Design a protein around this ligand. Structure first.
Ligand code: HEC
Ligand code: HEC
Lengths: 127, 127
């Protein structure tokens, strides 16, 4: 769907920005600093589910750019494992949210965050 | 979920960028320049549905910035009518996609596009 590599870069950066907001906005809830409303969180995690599937198709071959490391494309299988593992961590978060289980939500949230960082450490260029 | 107005601006711009991609990528399909696969379009319109609900919460009071006109906030009811009308146009597009009805999809696509433009004409600052 991208006319030039720049368009893929802009898409993925936008998708990832939206994920960071839908993930990060739950930090106060998991810390207990904001109240836990199970329905609110269930709905938010459903948005996060949708969003979490979107970036990867915008790293199609030849879409070097942005802060994407070239290793994304030189070992495609490894990158795919990391995004699939991240999405399965999102599945655990969805299960927790759908169950209304705050303890499970906290644990899953932490595992999701670790999975974001694991990918960044391998595949995101440093500042 | 936004620490500063800039964060709301960045969110909404990202959301709208993603909508433009999920909407616009169907242009060749509705024109017949690319093939029509009903399942593919159904899935894409479901993503567009989700995305189409997201920008509006990021125009909360005091989030002037970006290319948002101030009139968004001075007549809140009118802006709300436009976003709600746009989302109902998206409902028509979803119905068409879910039905696998290409004629209905073309018509709905055009009405959606008109609704994007109607809002921009009133509420988006010019270049
Ligand atoms: C887990 C919930 C997250 C969160 C919160 C974020 N990511 Fe990542 N990310 C990856 C790569 C390769 C990039 C660079 C993209 C490019 O510049 O081309 C990024 C970038 C981001 C951003 C910045 C977006 C921007 O505005 O430029 C943000 C906010 C972000 N990420 C948050 C790669 C990955 C992964 C590889 C499989 C995974 C998993 C994640 N990111 C997960 C997350
Ligand atoms: C219908 C499917 C669409 C499409 C394809 C787009 N929009 Fe809009 N839009 C609105 C406002 C107020 C702005 C400015 C936001 C800001 O700068 O603070 C925009 C902006 C955009 C963009 C640019 C995003 C960016 O990267 O900066 C794009 C690509 C975009 N839009 C596409 C307002 C509205 C509406 C008011 C109710 C409606 C409806 C739409 N937009 C619909 C659409």
């Amino acid at each position: 769907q991208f006319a030039k590599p720049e368009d893929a870069v802009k898409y993925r950066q936008s998708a990832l920005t939206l994920m960071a907001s839908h993930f990060g906005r739950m930090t106060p809830v998991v810390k207990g600093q904001a109240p836990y409303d199970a329905a609110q969180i269930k709905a938010n995690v459903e948005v996060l589910k949708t969003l979490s599937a979107l970036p990867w198709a915008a790293f199609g071959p030849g879409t070097e750019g942005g802060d994407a490391r070239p290793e994304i494309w030189s070992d495609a299988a490894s990158f795919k494992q990391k995004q699939q593992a991240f999405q399965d961590n999102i599945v655990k978060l969805s299960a927790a949210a759908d169950a209304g289980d705050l303890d499970k939500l906290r644990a899953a949230f932490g595992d999701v965050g670790a999975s974001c960082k694991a990918c960044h450490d391998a595949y995101e260029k440093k500042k």
